[PDB]
Design a protein around this ligand. Sequence first.
Ligand SMILES: CCCCCCCCCCCCCCCCCC(=O)OC[C@H](COP(=O)([O-])OCC(O)COP(=O)([O-])OC[C@@H](COC(=O)CCCCCCCCCCCCCCCCC)OC(=O)CCCCCCCCCCCCCCCCC)OC(=O)CCCCCCCCCCCCCCCCC
Lengths: 176, 68, 54, 163, 496, 79
Amino acid sequence: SFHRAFARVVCNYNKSIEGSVPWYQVKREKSPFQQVWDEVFTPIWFKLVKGPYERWEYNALVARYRGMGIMADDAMNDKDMIVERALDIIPEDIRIQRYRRMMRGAVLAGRKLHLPLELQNYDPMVPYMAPYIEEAKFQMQEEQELLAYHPWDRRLYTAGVSGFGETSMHSTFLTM
Amino acid sequence: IGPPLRTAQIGPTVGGNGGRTFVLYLTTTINVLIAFQVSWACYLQPRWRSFRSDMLEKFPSLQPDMDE
Amino acid sequence: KASTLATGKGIPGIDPKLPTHTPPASYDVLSSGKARPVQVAKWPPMPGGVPLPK
Amino acid sequence: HRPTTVKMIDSWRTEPSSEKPMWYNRFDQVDHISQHPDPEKTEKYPPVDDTRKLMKTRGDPHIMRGWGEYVYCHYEHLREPVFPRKPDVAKGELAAGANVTRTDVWKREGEPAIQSIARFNPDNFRPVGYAENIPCPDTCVPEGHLDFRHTRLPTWHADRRPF
Amino acid sequence: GKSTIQGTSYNVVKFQQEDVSEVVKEVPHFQFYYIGGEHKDNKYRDVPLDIPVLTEAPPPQLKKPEMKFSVLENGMRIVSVDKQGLTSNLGLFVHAGSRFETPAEEGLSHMVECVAFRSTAHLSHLRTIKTIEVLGMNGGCQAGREHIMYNLELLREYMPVASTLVVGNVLFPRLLPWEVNACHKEIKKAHERLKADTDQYVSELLHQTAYHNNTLGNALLANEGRALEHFTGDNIREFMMKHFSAERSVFVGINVDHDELCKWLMRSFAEYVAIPNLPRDEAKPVYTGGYKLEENADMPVCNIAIGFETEGWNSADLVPVTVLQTLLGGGGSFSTGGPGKGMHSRLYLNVLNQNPNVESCMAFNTQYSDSGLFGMYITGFGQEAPRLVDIALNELRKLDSFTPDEVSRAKNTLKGNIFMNAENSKVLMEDIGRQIIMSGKVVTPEEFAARVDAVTEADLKKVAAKLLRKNPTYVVYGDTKSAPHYEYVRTALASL
Amino acid sequence: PPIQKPLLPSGRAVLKHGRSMLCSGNLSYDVNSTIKAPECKRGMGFTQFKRFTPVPIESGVSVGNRGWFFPGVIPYQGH
Ligand SMILES: CCCCCCCCCCCCCCCCCC(=O)OC[C@H](COP(=O)([O-])OCC(O)COP(=O)([O-])OC[C@@H](COC(=O)CCCCCCCCCCCCCCCCC)OC(=O)CCCCCCCCCCCCCCCCC)OC(=O)CCCCCCCCCCCCCCCCC
């Protein structure tokens, strides 16, 4: 059987790369060719295109946040599952101010108005969600590794779920 | 009374989305194979034929006249 | 300088205790305790980051 | 949850957050969450009269590179290594998630271990300048904006139902 | 022996600094993922089980089991026996039970149990429980009145992992706010599990009535109302700092090599600081007696218990009162016991054989470090309660004398119970851990047998007289609408 | 070889609260013992099907709540 042979090849190739250091944890010296490229192109490209373009975009983004009166982390959409899992565990103090800012932003945006300049002198790029994003990612990675390492088989279209993995009832068209 | 207590959701909270991964792989495959055809027929192929036709100036063994 | 919020206290690059940027510092040993592997390249990087078989 | 997917993968070209944080990695750590300064009772940065006087912003416009559409964001979905890079909490770097559990950055010399790990609750870390920068709104209709008080008709107005 | 602790000598295990690289080599091998494999057909697919297939087996190496005692430099005592079984029973006992709670700290001991095996400094909650599972280990945590035990039953080969996991619950527990809040569910489950066991529920009522709002009386389970206010990670940590310390902890291991267990436990505490030992208020129990009539509308039967205070485990009355319990014995109509199963105990012969209306009659003897309860437990139909109490009181009045045949039968049965109970490994582990916590010493089953043989009728009379002088504790559970009043029980026992 | 224990390990303490190996009676047949060998009133074999968990069954008690609902709240179409 040729499948049994492939299973040995896969088993032996993975046993030979256990404990390997990830590519980003290896001290890496750039190739001489890359070094020449990074001394001619990168400098000029930053001074003429990247630098100005990305400052133009960044400054506009800061202004838009200041007009809405919101922080950068407020802009995250909770349809993303990492954001949702983080928002479960934020403290109430952070949670209360986050809601009020988002509410004011939507009112202003809907009514085509902008926050009074008196209230716009703040740093919108303060990463207040960072601790909880990292915790959420850790929790999700554990679940991924310890509970979702195989494409499991389940009875299909039973109990209001397709059996293909989703956990909420009536969350697909075919599950109505 | 009071605010709801914080608790993590028992997971996994992701999964069940294989149809979207199929569309990704099908679309990438089709469009990757369209790139090969368009790159070949519109640029490479034409230039290759010209080279071969100018490699017939050597005419050591150019195509025979009859050989029908 | 940067002794008050008006003077610039807490503004990165304007406050003496806050750097303009916060790049991660280099390390010579991995957190496992293994020595950090070192590689010297003599050819340009692979086009997609595509790893090569062992 | 509905059929959903997260790009929690080991990238071949982009590093994990534990190796290269994209946020301004300076945080203030406290022993208990109550010791954080209160944003509502903290004086904010002085107001300005011109948009060209508004303070500078800690974000790095060029945090991300390569081909692609421009984006500025602090977070990604990438998976973290088994042995994450030890965060430099002494200088204010954040320690949360994988870089606390799978590292020994929390250990103190003589402190009881239970007390040491307690200080690394994600609630005990807040960004520097949080209380002096976060907007704490008291209303969704700021002063000078139109609301029902201004649009209300005079009490002698005629019935507007018939029209 | 290099150190004597509370009357027992221990060999001191010294902390050593070893590289993670070198200890990793000694960790048991196991995989969570199997990514491919080498196919190999089942060679015994055609061999019936009646045909032996194993040849050239190494000769066995049998050693008489002996209990060995060691102590780490942090003060944690390690006591292990190796009966050469193939499954081990590792347990961690901490001298922090419900009795050490202040009234404002009600239920905290149970809360610690509820948060067991949650996230630690170097392991998430999910990873701890999935490891215990993939390795086929069972166990849990139980909080008592004097101690809290964390136990894991495992194949001996995986002890290095289990020791680490158990110790992490007391060394660097991360009592994260949202993980603790997820444990509020366990309180309601605990109450249901207690009330389902009628005998244990009536025992909880006895202790609460016996010792009024003090040490042993302190409720064993937290309530799900006002107690949830301080069911928080911060509150739990403060409780652990007060009571949980290496000096008050004892790691017991059954069917484990002592030198190996000591090594891995040493490595677990070497680079970390355990909770420092601090003085705490340790007040002797105050026995008040009293009565409680708890009604269960669904039950038609009446459970009656009359108890008296005993000096406890550390007294010289322990063995004599246990002989008295076996002498009075008891049984239940539900059970049909063959020869040697208590058919000739005094209660069975005097109560069960002569009173068809009595559903069950038994003697109980709880024992704690410095106090205990002894008495009779009788059950029947609700309307029979007045007669059930009379039967119980009459038996209590017959404890003035004992026949020589009864004493000998009680002593022999007690010795048989001791030896037969001891062979169970989980029982032995819990007995050792609870012994050291209570007394700091371990009395072996053989030594207890020697004490049992020295009990005379005079000792039984003396102990019984002391018990009957205490104010009775009178608990009625179930259908209580016909039970006598507490003063009737008191007046009957006033003569004694 | 025969299996003498239920597939679901108890995971609980054998000895009851306050009872020791000296005063627990005989754990092989005592009524309060958690490891008493069951009774063969109708013969041997039913222990392979017996539920050794002491707490009576509560039909329909929920165990599949991932924290999405409060107690007493009825989910509607799983939401
Ligand atoms: C007028 C100008 C014309 C220009 C024409 C050419 C323009 C090309 C533009 C795109 C390529 C730029 C250069 C690429 C260098 C190599 C990159 C590489 O290795 O990437 C790995 C690298 C993985 O790094 P990563 O950061 O870990 O990725 C994380 C992702 O989230 C991944 O998420 P995940 O973890 O879920 O993984 C999803 C999975 C999804 O992958 C799949 O679905 C796998 C299956 C489809 C792709 C591979 C097979 C395609 C078919 C090949 C031929 C089969 C022949 C079979 C013959 C059989 C005969 C029997 O993909 C991957 O894992 C990475 C591969 C991504 C797909 C593309 C791989 C091939 C790259 C080359 C594209 C074609 C170039 C043609 C050039 C023509 C001459 C100029 O990928 C990236 O850097 C990101 C993606 C970049 C490419 C996006 C492509 C979008 C789809 C359309 C492609 C074609 C567009 C143009 C069509 C124009 C005419 C229609």
